[PDB]
Protein backbone atom coordinates (compact mmCIF):
# COMPACT_ATOMS: atom_id res chain seq x y z
CA UNK A 1 0.00 0.00 0.00
CA UNK A 2 0.75 3.41 -0.71
CA UNK A 3 1.38 4.80 2.73
CA UNK A 4 5.33 4.54 2.98
CA UNK A 5 7.51 7.31 5.21
CA UNK A 6 8.91 9.57 2.09
CA UNK A 7 12.30 10.17 4.18
CA UNK A 8 12.15 13.04 6.98
CA UNK A 9 13.33 11.15 9.66
CA UNK A 10 15.29 8.11 8.10
CA UNK A 11 17.14 10.91 6.45
CA UNK A 12 16.40 9.35 2.55
CA UNK A 13 15.17 13.04 2.38
CA UNK A 14 18.31 15.17 2.13
CA UNK A 15 19.61 18.30 3.87
CA UNK A 16 19.00 20.03 0.56
CA UNK A 17 15.93 18.69 -0.81
CA UNK A 18 14.24 20.92 2.79
CA UNK A 19 14.00 24.88 2.79
CA UNK A 20 11.45 27.46 3.88
CA UNK A 21 10.57 30.65 3.44
CA UNK A 22 12.68 32.00 6.28
CA UNK A 23 14.25 30.58 9.44
CA UNK A 24 14.78 32.00 12.98
CA UNK A 25 17.93 34.02 13.39
CA UNK A 26 19.71 32.30 15.73
CA UNK A 27 20.27 29.54 13.46
CA UNK A 28 18.76 27.13 15.87
CA UNK A 29 15.24 26.07 14.27
CA UNK A 30 16.50 25.82 10.70
CA UNK A 31 14.69 23.73 8.54
CA UNK A 32 17.02 20.80 8.57
CA UNK A 33 15.81 20.20 11.86
CA UNK A 34 12.21 19.57 10.85
CA UNK A 35 12.40 15.78 10.85
CA UNK A 36 9.97 14.14 12.79
CA UNK A 37 11.35 12.80 16.16
CA UNK A 38 14.51 15.03 15.27
CA UNK A 39 16.09 15.75 19.21
CA UNK A 40 17.46 19.10 17.96
CA UNK A 41 14.33 21.82 18.04
CA UNK A 42 12.70 21.99 14.90
CA UNK A 43 12.06 24.26 12.02
CA UNK A 44 10.73 27.98 12.82
CA UNK A 45 10.67 30.67 10.76
CA UNK A 46 11.94 34.59 11.14
CA UNK A 47 8.25 35.63 12.19
CA UNK A 48 5.50 33.95 13.23
CA UNK A 49 2.52 34.69 10.43
CA UNK A 50 0.67 32.71 8.28
CA UNK A 51 2.60 33.50 4.93
CA UNK A 52 5.66 31.23 6.34
CA UNK A 53 5.88 27.54 4.83
CA UNK A 54 8.16 24.73 4.66
CA UNK A 55 9.06 23.19 1.99
CA UNK A 56 9.71 19.64 0.97
CA UNK A 57 11.28 18.74 -2.87
CA UNK A 58 11.08 15.07 -3.60
CA UNK A 59 13.04 15.12 -6.33
CA UNK A 60 10.64 13.07 -8.59
CA UNK A 61 6.57 13.01 -8.66
CA UNK A 62 5.71 11.18 -5.78
CA UNK A 63 2.50 9.71 -4.76
CA UNK A 64 1.44 11.86 -1.35
CA UNK A 65 -0.96 10.04 0.84
CA UNK A 66 -0.10 11.17 4.23
CA UNK A 67 1.27 13.99 6.88
CA UNK A 68 2.35 13.44 10.41
CA UNK A 69 3.43 16.68 12.41
CA UNK A 70 4.79 17.21 15.72
CA UNK A 71 5.98 20.40 17.80
CA UNK A 72 9.01 21.58 19.05
CA UNK A 73 10.77 21.76 22.66
CA UNK A 74 13.32 24.26 22.84
CA UNK A 75 16.61 22.85 24.15
CA UNK A 76 17.71 26.30 25.25
CA UNK A 77 14.45 27.14 26.76
CA UNK A 78 12.48 24.11 27.63
CA UNK A 79 9.61 26.02 26.24
CA UNK A 80 7.30 23.90 23.74
CA UNK A 81 5.86 25.20 19.98
CA UNK A 82 3.65 23.54 17.88
CA UNK A 83 1.77 24.28 15.09
CA UNK A 84 -2.42 23.68 15.55
CA UNK A 85 -3.39 23.76 11.87
CA UNK A 86 -2.04 24.21 8.69
CA UNK A 87 -2.63 24.36 4.54
CA UNK A 88 -0.96 22.15 2.24
CA UNK A 89 0.33 23.53 -1.29
CA UNK A 90 1.64 21.37 -3.80
CA UNK A 91 3.93 21.40 -7.42
CA UNK A 92 5.49 19.30 -10.13
CA UNK A 93 7.53 22.10 -10.64
CA UNK A 94 8.13 24.75 -7.72
CA UNK A 95 6.86 27.51 -10.13
CA UNK A 96 3.39 26.36 -9.89
CA UNK A 97 1.43 25.86 -7.22
CA UNK A 98 -1.89 24.04 -6.00
CA UNK A 99 -3.63 24.68 -2.39
CA UNK A 100 -5.08 21.51 -1.41
CA UNK A 101 -9.06 22.24 -1.16
CA UNK A 102 -11.68 20.10 0.21
CA UNK A 103 -14.95 21.26 -1.61
CA UNK A 104 -14.97 24.20 -3.07
CA UNK A 105 -12.50 25.67 0.02
CA UNK A 106 -8.79 25.33 1.08
CA UNK A 107 -8.26 22.10 3.34
CA UNK A 108 -7.64 23.25 6.93
CA UNK A 109 -5.88 20.69 8.66
CA UNK A 110 -6.14 20.18 12.23
CA UNK A 111 -2.53 19.75 13.65
CA UNK A 112 -0.92 19.76 16.85
CA UNK A 113 -2.30 20.15 20.14
CA UNK A 114 1.19 20.09 22.04
CA UNK A 115 4.57 19.94 21.24
CA UNK A 116 5.19 15.87 21.80
CA UNK A 117 2.99 14.17 20.18
CA UNK A 118 2.70 12.68 16.63
CA UNK A 119 -0.63 13.97 14.94
CA UNK A 120 -1.17 12.19 11.38
CA UNK A 121 -3.55 13.07 9.06
CA UNK A 122 -4.77 11.39 5.70
CA UNK A 123 -5.30 12.93 2.65
CA UNK A 124 -9.28 12.47 1.65
CA UNK A 125 -7.76 12.40 -2.00
CA UNK A 126 -3.93 11.09 -2.61
CA UNK A 127 -1.72 13.56 -4.68
CA UNK A 128 1.07 12.97 -7.51
CA UNK A 129 3.49 15.85 -6.83
CA UNK A 130 7.43 17.03 -6.23
CA UNK A 131 7.39 20.15 -4.20
CA UNK A 132 5.37 20.58 -0.91
CA UNK A 133 4.82 23.34 1.12
CA UNK A 134 3.08 23.01 5.00
CA UNK A 135 1.80 26.59 5.39
CA UNK A 136 1.08 27.03 9.51
CA UNK A 137 -2.52 29.05 9.95
CA UNK A 138 -2.79 28.56 13.94
CA UNK A 139 -0.58 28.04 16.55
CA UNK A 140 0.65 27.83 20.02
CA UNK A 141 3.19 30.46 21.51
CA UNK A 142 4.62 30.18 18.46
CA UNK A 143 5.45 28.03 15.13
CA UNK A 144 7.85 24.74 14.91
CA UNK A 145 7.59 21.91 12.94
CA UNK A 146 8.75 18.72 12.69
CA UNK A 147 7.50 16.21 10.08
CA UNK A 148 6.97 13.06 8.09
CA UNK A 149 5.08 12.43 4.57
CA UNK A 150 3.92 8.89 3.48
CA UNK A 151 3.24 7.69 -0.20
CA UNK A 152 4.81 5.64 -2.63
CA UNK A 153 6.33 6.40 -6.14
CA UNK A 154 3.57 5.53 -9.43
CA UNK A 155 6.53 2.49 -10.20
CA UNK A 156 6.35 0.72 -6.89
CA UNK A 157 2.79 -0.71 -8.86
CA UNK A 158 3.10 -3.32 -11.26
CA UNK A 159 3.70 -2.49 -15.20
CA UNK A 160 3.77 0.89 -14.54
CA UNK A 161 6.54 2.50 -15.84
CA UNK A 162 6.41 5.99 -17.27
CA UNK A 163 7.05 5.14 -20.79
CA UNK A 164 8.89 8.38 -22.04
CA UNK A 165 7.02 11.58 -22.32
CA UNK A 166 8.35 12.86 -19.40
CA UNK A 167 11.77 11.71 -19.78
CA UNK A 168 12.08 12.28 -23.72
CA UNK A 169 12.62 8.61 -24.39
CA UNK A 170 9.52 9.52 -26.59
CA UNK A 171 10.46 11.18 -29.56
CA UNK A 172 9.56 14.53 -30.98
CA UNK A 173 7.85 12.65 -33.88
CA UNK A 174 6.08 10.35 -32.08
CA UNK A 175 3.61 12.69 -30.58
CA UNK A 176 0.82 14.32 -32.53
CA UNK A 177 -2.62 15.62 -32.22
CA UNK A 178 -5.67 16.24 -34.39
CA UNK A 179 -5.55 20.48 -34.50
CA UNK A 180 -2.80 22.84 -32.89
CA UNK A 181 -3.67 26.68 -31.42
CA UNK A 182 0.02 27.69 -32.76
CA UNK A 183 1.21 26.18 -36.53
CA UNK A 184 5.17 24.77 -36.63
CA UNK A 185 3.62 23.74 -33.04
CA UNK A 186 6.72 21.92 -31.12
CA UNK A 187 5.05 18.30 -30.16
CA UNK A 188 7.25 18.83 -27.42
CA UNK A 189 4.63 21.09 -25.15
CA UNK A 190 2.54 18.02 -24.72
CA UNK A 191 5.29 16.24 -22.48
CA UNK A 192 4.25 16.07 -18.35
CA UNK A 193 5.38 17.88 -15.82
CA UNK A 194 8.61 18.86 -18.58
CA UNK A 195 6.58 20.81 -20.63
CA UNK A 196 6.31 24.82 -19.88
CA UNK A 197 3.19 25.19 -22.01
CA UNK A 198 0.83 22.43 -23.08
CA UNK A 199 -1.24 20.87 -25.88
CA UNK A 200 -4.04 23.48 -27.05
CA UNK A 201 -6.32 22.47 -29.94
CA UNK A 202 -6.84 25.31 -32.84
CA UNK A 203 -9.78 26.34 -30.68
CA UNK A 204 -9.46 25.36 -27.34
CA UNK A 205 -13.06 25.82 -26.85
CA UNK A 206 -13.44 22.90 -28.97
CA UNK A 207 -16.29 20.03 -29.65
CA UNK A 208 -17.01 17.02 -27.76
CA UNK A 209 -15.35 14.24 -29.78
CA UNK A 210 -13.20 16.06 -31.88
CA UNK A 211 -9.93 16.38 -30.56
CA UNK A 212 -7.47 14.05 -29.71
CA UNK A 213 -3.49 13.95 -28.71
CA UNK A 214 -1.60 11.21 -30.01
CA UNK A 215 0.86 9.42 -28.30
CA UNK A 216 3.06 6.58 -30.58
CA UNK A 217 5.29 4.25 -28.61
CA UNK A 218 7.48 3.03 -31.33
CA UNK A 219 6.49 -0.69 -30.60
CA UNK A 220 3.53 -1.90 -29.12
CA UNK A 221 3.53 -2.06 -25.38
CA UNK A 222 0.99 -3.34 -22.27
CA UNK A 223 -0.53 0.40 -21.63
CA UNK A 224 -1.62 0.35 -18.05
CA UNK A 225 -2.62 3.97 -17.66
CA UNK A 226 -2.28 7.63 -18.32
CA UNK A 227 -1.02 10.49 -15.92
CA UNK A 228 -2.73 13.83 -17.41
CA UNK A 229 -2.23 17.34 -16.43
CA UNK A 230 -3.46 20.80 -17.63
CA UNK A 231 -1.38 23.22 -19.24
CA UNK A 232 0.13 26.50 -18.48
CA UNK A 233 -8.41 31.23 -17.15
CA UNK A 234 -6.45 28.09 -16.39
CA UNK A 235 -6.74 25.32 -19.06
CA UNK A 236 -6.85 21.67 -18.39
CA UNK A 237 -9.29 18.36 -19.28
CA UNK A 238 -12.02 17.37 -17.36
CA UNK A 239 -13.56 14.55 -19.09
CA UNK A 240 -11.66 12.37 -21.40
CA UNK A 241 -11.74 8.74 -23.26
CA UNK A 242 -9.01 6.56 -24.47
CA UNK A 243 -8.65 5.05 -27.35
CA UNK A 244 -5.72 2.51 -28.52
CA UNK A 245 -4.20 0.62 -31.44
CA UNK A 246 -2.15 -2.14 -31.86
CA UNK A 247 -1.31 -2.35 -35.53
CA UNK A 248 -2.21 1.22 -36.07
CA UNK A 249 -5.42 0.46 -38.41
CA UNK A 250 -8.02 -0.94 -36.00
CA UNK A 251 -8.64 1.58 -32.77
CA UNK A 252 -10.78 0.31 -29.71
CA UNK A 253 -12.02 2.83 -26.53
CA UNK A 254 -11.41 1.67 -23.22
CA UNK A 255 -15.01 0.34 -22.02
CA UNK A 256 -16.75 1.25 -18.72
CA UNK A 257 -18.03 -2.50 -18.24
CA UNK A 258 -20.95 -1.44 -16.18
CA UNK A 259 -22.06 1.00 -19.29
CA UNK A 260 -21.12 -0.75 -22.37
CA UNK A 261 -19.55 2.58 -23.85
CA UNK A 262 -16.61 4.30 -24.22
CA UNK A 263 -15.26 4.84 -20.47
CA UNK A 264 -15.52 8.61 -19.44
CA UNK A 265 -12.36 9.32 -17.47
CA UNK A 266 -11.98 12.39 -14.80
CA UNK A 267 -9.78 14.74 -15.80
CA UNK A 268 -7.81 17.41 -14.08
CA UNK A 269 -8.97 20.02 -11.23
CA UNK A 270 -6.10 22.38 -11.98
CA UNK A 271 -3.62 23.11 -14.72
CA UNK A 272 -0.64 21.73 -12.89
CA UNK A 273 -1.55 19.07 -10.46
CA UNK A 274 -1.85 16.03 -12.51
CA UNK A 275 -3.74 12.81 -11.77
CA UNK A 276 -3.28 9.15 -12.58
CA UNK A 277 -5.79 6.92 -14.72
CA UNK A 278 -5.39 3.50 -14.91
CA UNK A 279 -6.93 0.55 -17.07
CA UNK A 280 -7.08 -2.88 -17.14
CA UNK A 281 -3.68 -3.39 -18.99
CA UNK A 282 -3.78 -3.45 -23.32
CA UNK A 283 -1.55 -4.37 -25.76
CA UNK A 284 -0.86 -1.14 -27.49
CA UNK A 285 1.57 0.81 -30.00
CA UNK A 286 -0.67 3.79 -30.53
CA UNK A 287 -2.96 5.82 -27.81
CA UNK A 288 -4.98 8.61 -28.03
CA UNK A 289 -6.78 11.19 -25.31
CA UNK A 290 -9.70 12.49 -26.95
CA UNK A 291 -10.95 15.39 -24.48
CA UNK A 292 -15.08 15.54 -23.90
CA UNK A 293 -14.91 18.24 -21.17
CA UNK A 294 -12.85 21.28 -19.85
CA UNK A 295 -12.09 23.93 -17.95
CA UNK A 296 -13.68 27.08 -18.51
CA UNK A 297 -10.52 28.49 -20.33
CA UNK A 298 -10.82 25.63 -23.09
CA UNK A 299 -8.62 22.41 -24.11
CA UNK A 300 -5.08 22.13 -22.16
CA UNK A 301 -3.01 19.46 -21.70
CA UNK A 302 0.20 17.58 -20.84
CA UNK A 303 0.42 13.88 -20.31
CA UNK A 304 2.74 10.57 -20.09
CA UNK A 305 1.52 7.13 -20.78
CA UNK A 306 2.00 4.24 -18.32
CA UNK A 307 3.11 0.37 -18.50
CA UNK A 308 5.52 -1.68 -19.88
CA UNK A 309 7.22 -4.21 -22.05
CA UNK A 310 4.46 -6.05 -24.40
CA UNK A 311 4.69 -9.98 -25.50
CA UNK A 312 2.93 -11.37 -28.38
CA UNK A 313 3.04 -14.65 -27.21
CA UNK A 314 0.25 -15.85 -25.14
CA UNK A 315 0.74 -19.77 -24.10
CA UNK A 316 -1.78 -21.86 -25.32
CA UNK B 1 15.03 52.91 46.65
CA UNK B 2 16.03 56.86 46.35
CA UNK B 3 16.48 57.95 50.10
CA UNK B 4 20.48 57.60 49.97
CA UNK B 5 22.36 60.18 52.50
CA UNK B 6 24.25 62.21 49.48
CA UNK B 7 27.22 62.87 51.50
CA UNK B 8 27.26 65.64 53.43
CA UNK B 9 28.05 63.84 56.52
CA UNK B 10 30.54 61.01 54.57
CA UNK B 11 32.26 63.70 52.84
CA UNK B 12 31.51 62.78 49.26
CA UNK B 13 30.13 66.14 48.84
CA UNK B 14 33.50 67.76 48.93
CA UNK B 15 34.50 70.93 51.16
CA UNK B 16 34.57 73.07 47.86
CA UNK B 17 30.90 71.86 46.75
CA UNK B 18 29.63 73.74 49.99
CA UNK B 19 28.70 77.41 49.36
CA UNK B 20 26.74 80.70 51.02
CA UNK B 21 25.17 83.79 50.30
CA UNK B 22 27.94 85.21 52.91
CA UNK B 23 29.02 83.75 56.50
CA UNK B 24 29.71 85.00 59.71
CA UNK B 25 32.91 87.58 60.10
CA UNK B 26 35.10 85.35 62.96
CA UNK B 27 35.34 82.64 59.85
CA UNK B 28 33.97 80.00 62.89
CA UNK B 29 30.51 79.48 60.93
CA UNK B 30 31.47 78.64 57.35
CA UNK B 31 29.73 76.66 54.98
CA UNK B 32 31.99 73.63 55.38
CA UNK B 33 30.76 73.58 59.06
CA UNK B 34 27.09 72.85 57.65
CA UNK B 35 27.54 68.84 57.43
CA UNK B 36 25.10 66.90 60.04
CA UNK B 37 26.58 65.80 62.92
CA UNK B 38 29.34 67.98 62.24
CA UNK B 39 31.06 68.55 66.04
CA UNK B 40 32.54 72.65 65.22
CA UNK B 41 29.34 75.10 65.04
CA UNK B 42 27.41 75.08 61.74
CA UNK B 43 26.64 77.41 58.78
CA UNK B 44 25.73 81.01 59.98
CA UNK B 45 24.95 83.89 57.40
CA UNK B 46 27.01 87.30 57.98
CA UNK B 47 23.51 88.83 58.94
CA UNK B 48 20.47 87.28 60.03
CA UNK B 49 18.14 87.43 57.47
CA UNK B 50 15.75 85.28 55.13
CA UNK B 51 17.46 86.90 52.32
CA UNK B 52 20.50 84.32 52.99
CA UNK B 53 21.35 80.52 51.96
CA UNK B 54 23.37 77.67 52.00
CA UNK B 55 24.46 76.42 48.63
CA UNK B 56 25.08 72.92 47.42
CA UNK B 57 26.47 71.50 44.25
CA UNK B 58 25.67 67.99 43.34
CA UNK B 59 28.01 68.37 40.48
CA UNK B 60 25.68 66.14 37.93
CA UNK B 61 22.03 66.03 37.51
CA UNK B 62 20.59 64.38 40.90
CA UNK B 63 17.58 62.81 42.29
CA UNK B 64 16.34 65.00 45.74
CA UNK B 65 13.96 63.48 48.03
CA UNK B 66 14.86 64.45 51.50
CA UNK B 67 16.08 67.11 53.76
CA UNK B 68 17.84 66.91 56.61
CA UNK B 69 18.53 69.53 59.57
CA UNK B 70 19.94 70.34 62.53
CA UNK B 71 20.84 73.56 64.48
CA UNK B 72 24.28 74.25 66.36
CA UNK B 73 25.28 74.90 69.58
CA UNK B 74 28.15 77.26 69.95
CA UNK B 75 31.70 75.97 71.21
CA UNK B 76 32.66 79.37 72.03
CA UNK B 77 29.91 80.19 73.98
CA UNK B 78 27.32 77.05 74.38
CA UNK B 79 24.90 79.05 72.98
CA UNK B 80 21.65 77.11 71.01
CA UNK B 81 21.36 78.16 67.16
CA UNK B 82 18.38 76.51 64.62
CA UNK B 83 16.91 77.26 61.82
CA UNK B 84 12.04 76.54 62.66
CA UNK B 85 11.59 77.27 58.56
CA UNK B 86 13.02 77.52 55.58
CA UNK B 87 12.36 77.62 51.63
CA UNK B 88 14.36 75.40 48.95
CA UNK B 89 15.23 76.63 45.79
CA UNK B 90 16.94 74.19 42.74
CA UNK B 91 18.93 74.84 39.36
CA UNK B 92 20.25 72.85 37.25
CA UNK B 93 22.96 75.10 35.72
CA UNK B 94 23.71 77.63 38.82
CA UNK B 95 22.09 80.45 37.08
CA UNK B 96 18.50 79.62 36.81
CA UNK B 97 16.60 79.29 40.13
CA UNK B 98 13.36 77.30 40.91
CA UNK B 99 11.91 77.91 44.52
CA UNK B 100 10.35 74.06 45.79
CA UNK B 101 6.20 74.69 45.34
CA UNK B 102 3.54 73.02 47.25
CA UNK B 103 0.61 73.98 44.95
CA UNK B 104 0.24 77.43 44.31
CA UNK B 105 2.72 78.89 46.73
CA UNK B 106 6.20 78.24 47.94
CA UNK B 107 6.86 75.45 50.49
CA UNK B 108 7.71 76.25 53.70
CA UNK B 109 9.79 73.65 55.12
CA UNK B 110 9.23 73.20 58.95
CA UNK B 111 12.90 72.59 60.56
CA UNK B 112 14.32 72.13 63.95
CA UNK B 113 12.88 73.14 67.45
CA UNK B 114 16.45 72.70 69.07
CA UNK B 115 19.99 72.90 67.90
CA UNK B 116 20.74 68.99 68.91
CA UNK B 117 17.92 67.15 66.97
CA UNK B 118 17.73 66.31 63.45
CA UNK B 119 14.34 67.38 61.66
CA UNK B 120 13.65 64.98 58.45
CA UNK B 121 11.48 66.68 55.47
CA UNK B 122 10.46 64.01 52.84
CA UNK B 123 9.82 66.13 49.46
CA UNK B 124 6.10 65.40 48.58
CA UNK B 125 7.56 65.32 44.88
CA UNK B 126 11.00 64.12 44.47
CA UNK B 127 13.48 66.72 42.02
CA UNK B 128 16.00 66.42 39.52
CA UNK B 129 18.75 68.83 39.92
CA UNK B 130 22.49 69.79 40.23
CA UNK B 131 22.40 72.73 42.90
CA UNK B 132 20.51 73.07 46.26
CA UNK B 133 19.98 75.65 48.22
CA UNK B 134 18.03 76.49 51.58
CA UNK B 135 16.77 79.53 52.42
CA UNK B 136 15.96 80.15 56.68
CA UNK B 137 13.25 82.33 56.77
CA UNK B 138 12.51 81.75 60.73
CA UNK B 139 15.26 80.91 63.27
CA UNK B 140 15.87 80.55 67.29
CA UNK B 141 18.61 82.75 68.27
CA UNK B 142 19.88 83.04 65.10
CA UNK B 143 20.80 81.61 62.01
CA UNK B 144 23.03 78.27 62.52
CA UNK B 145 22.45 75.35 59.59
CA UNK B 146 24.11 71.62 59.55
CA UNK B 147 22.28 69.46 56.89
CA UNK B 148 22.09 66.40 55.02
CA UNK B 149 20.82 65.87 51.02
CA UNK B 150 18.94 62.60 50.43
CA UNK B 151 18.32 60.86 47.23
CA UNK B 152 20.09 59.33 44.19
CA UNK B 153 21.08 59.23 40.75
CA UNK B 154 19.38 58.52 37.50
CA UNK B 155 21.73 56.12 36.35
CA UNK B 156 21.08 54.21 39.64
CA UNK B 157 17.74 52.61 37.94
CA UNK B 158 18.55 49.35 35.36
CA UNK B 159 18.81 49.74 31.63
CA UNK B 160 18.65 54.42 32.53
CA UNK B 161 21.77 55.49 30.93
CA UNK B 162 21.45 59.01 29.80
CA UNK B 163 21.92 58.48 25.84
CA UNK B 164 23.82 61.18 24.78
CA UNK B 165 21.73 64.30 24.24
CA UNK B 166 23.68 66.14 27.13
CA UNK B 167 27.04 65.03 27.07
CA UNK B 168 27.34 65.62 23.32
CA UNK B 169 27.65 61.97 22.43
CA UNK B 170 24.96 62.30 20.02
CA UNK B 171 25.53 64.74 17.33
CA UNK B 172 23.99 67.78 15.90
CA UNK B 173 23.11 65.79 12.90
CA UNK B 174 21.35 63.13 15.21
CA UNK B 175 18.92 65.88 16.28
CA UNK B 176 15.78 67.43 13.94
CA UNK B 177 12.50 69.02 14.52
CA UNK B 178 8.96 69.51 12.75
CA UNK B 179 9.48 73.54 12.66
CA UNK B 180 12.31 76.00 13.77
CA UNK B 181 11.81 79.55 15.29
CA UNK B 182 14.95 80.53 13.88
CA UNK B 183 16.72 79.02 10.19
CA UNK B 184 20.07 78.15 10.09
CA UNK B 185 18.84 76.46 14.38
CA UNK B 186 21.46 74.52 15.63
CA UNK B 187 20.76 71.41 16.94
CA UNK B 188 22.20 71.70 20.04
CA UNK B 189 20.06 74.26 21.17
CA UNK B 190 17.68 70.98 22.37
CA UNK B 191 20.23 69.43 24.75
CA UNK B 192 18.83 69.08 27.98
CA UNK B 193 20.95 70.92 30.84
CA UNK B 194 23.90 71.76 28.48
CA UNK B 195 21.82 73.73 26.87
CA UNK B 196 21.23 77.78 26.90
CA UNK B 197 18.02 77.91 24.88
CA UNK B 198 15.92 75.41 23.87
CA UNK B 199 14.17 73.89 21.31
CA UNK B 200 10.87 76.35 19.56
CA UNK B 201 9.19 75.71 16.60
CA UNK B 202 8.41 78.17 14.29
CA UNK B 203 5.24 79.13 15.97
CA UNK B 204 5.68 78.18 19.49
CA UNK B 205 2.30 78.75 19.95
CA UNK B 206 1.54 75.94 17.83
CA UNK B 207 -0.95 73.40 17.23
CA UNK B 208 -1.48 69.84 19.40
CA UNK B 209 0.33 66.69 17.65
CA UNK B 210 1.91 69.24 14.42
CA UNK B 211 5.03 69.63 16.13
CA UNK B 212 7.92 67.32 17.40
CA UNK B 213 11.82 66.64 18.40
CA UNK B 214 13.31 63.76 16.76
CA UNK B 215 16.44 62.11 18.35
CA UNK B 216 17.94 59.50 16.29
CA UNK B 217 20.55 57.35 18.40
CA UNK B 218 22.57 55.93 15.44
CA UNK B 219 21.49 52.44 16.28
CA UNK B 220 18.88 50.74 17.75
CA UNK B 221 18.67 50.97 21.35
CA UNK B 222 16.47 49.86 24.43
CA UNK B 223 14.53 53.19 25.01
CA UNK B 224 13.27 53.43 29.06
CA UNK B 225 11.92 57.07 28.86
CA UNK B 226 13.12 60.93 28.68
CA UNK B 227 14.25 63.80 30.66
CA UNK B 228 12.31 66.34 29.08
CA UNK B 229 13.14 70.39 30.22
CA UNK B 230 11.97 74.12 29.71
CA UNK B 231 13.45 76.52 27.39
CA UNK B 232 15.54 79.61 28.22
CA UNK B 233 6.82 84.29 29.94
CA UNK B 234 8.59 81.13 30.38
CA UNK B 235 8.48 77.99 28.14
CA UNK B 236 7.80 74.55 28.60
CA UNK B 237 5.94 71.60 27.42
CA UNK B 238 2.91 70.69 29.61
CA UNK B 239 1.68 67.88 27.69
CA UNK B 240 3.41 65.31 24.98
CA UNK B 241 3.18 62.02 23.30
CA UNK B 242 5.80 59.77 22.69
CA UNK B 243 6.38 57.84 19.41
CA UNK B 244 9.32 55.29 18.49
CA UNK B 245 10.63 53.98 15.31
CA UNK B 246 12.80 50.69 15.00
CA UNK B 247 13.64 51.06 11.28
CA UNK B 248 13.61 54.57 10.75
CA UNK B 249 9.71 53.43 8.60
CA UNK B 250 7.46 52.29 11.18
CA UNK B 251 6.50 54.29 13.50
CA UNK B 252 4.25 53.96 17.30
CA UNK B 253 3.27 55.62 20.23
CA UNK B 254 3.73 54.88 23.34
CA UNK B 255 0.26 53.27 24.55
CA UNK B 256 -1.68 54.69 27.57
CA UNK B 257 -3.12 50.67 28.98
CA UNK B 258 -5.77 51.70 30.61
CA UNK B 259 -7.28 54.54 27.84
CA UNK B 260 -5.60 52.21 24.84
CA UNK B 261 -4.84 55.52 22.93
CA UNK B 262 -1.02 57.11 22.94
CA UNK B 263 0.31 58.28 26.36
CA UNK B 264 -0.46 61.83 27.61
CA UNK B 265 3.07 62.43 29.82
CA UNK B 266 3.33 64.87 32.12
CA UNK B 267 5.74 67.91 31.29
CA UNK B 268 7.38 70.71 33.05
CA UNK B 269 6.32 72.86 35.72
CA UNK B 270 8.90 75.33 35.20
CA UNK B 271 11.65 76.60 32.41
CA UNK B 272 14.39 74.98 34.43
CA UNK B 273 13.83 72.34 36.41
CA UNK B 274 13.45 68.58 34.28
CA UNK B 275 11.27 65.94 35.11
CA UNK B 276 12.01 62.25 34.40
CA UNK B 277 9.17 60.20 32.06
CA UNK B 278 10.07 56.38 32.16
CA UNK B 279 7.70 54.02 30.81
CA UNK B 280 7.81 50.20 29.81
CA UNK B 281 11.38 49.67 28.27
CA UNK B 282 10.87 49.43 24.28
CA UNK B 283 13.68 49.09 21.02
CA UNK B 284 14.23 52.28 19.05
CA UNK B 285 16.77 54.19 16.92
CA UNK B 286 14.02 56.94 16.61
CA UNK B 287 12.25 59.08 19.28
CA UNK B 288 10.01 62.10 18.39
CA UNK B 289 8.44 64.21 21.76
CA UNK B 290 5.24 65.80 20.15
CA UNK B 291 4.08 68.36 22.17
CA UNK B 292 0.36 69.06 22.99
CA UNK B 293 -0.26 71.62 25.64
CA UNK B 294 2.23 74.01 27.00
CA UNK B 295 2.94 77.01 29.27
CA UNK B 296 1.54 80.59 28.32
CA UNK B 297 4.89 81.40 26.09
CA UNK B 298 4.52 78.71 24.04
CA UNK B 299 6.85 75.16 23.09
CA UNK B 300 9.97 75.52 24.50
CA UNK B 301 12.18 72.23 25.07
CA UNK B 302 14.85 70.27 25.87
CA UNK B 303 15.40 67.26 26.37
CA UNK B 304 17.49 63.60 26.71
CA UNK B 305 16.38 60.21 26.16
CA UNK B 306 17.15 57.24 29.11
CA UNK B 307 18.01 53.40 27.88
CA UNK B 308 20.40 50.85 27.32
CA UNK B 309 22.19 49.06 24.53
CA UNK B 310 19.63 46.54 22.49
CA UNK B 311 19.85 42.89 21.52
CA UNK B 312 18.05 41.80 18.43
CA UNK B 313 18.24 37.96 19.93
CA UNK B 314 15.49 36.78 21.83
CA UNK B 315 15.73 33.63 23.12
CA UNK B 316 13.54 30.94 21.91
Redesign the interface.
Same mark, same amino acid.
Given at each position: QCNVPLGMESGRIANEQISASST? %??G??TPQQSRLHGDDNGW?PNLDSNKEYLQVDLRFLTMLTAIATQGAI %?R??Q?G?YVKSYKLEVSTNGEDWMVYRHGKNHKVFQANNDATEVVLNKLHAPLLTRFVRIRPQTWHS?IALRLELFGCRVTDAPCSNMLGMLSGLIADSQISASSTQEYLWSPSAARLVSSRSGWFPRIPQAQPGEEWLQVDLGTPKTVKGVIIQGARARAFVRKFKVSYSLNGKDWEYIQDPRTQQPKLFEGNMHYDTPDIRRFDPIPAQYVRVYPERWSPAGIGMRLEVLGCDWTSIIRR
Open positions: Y %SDRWT %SETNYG
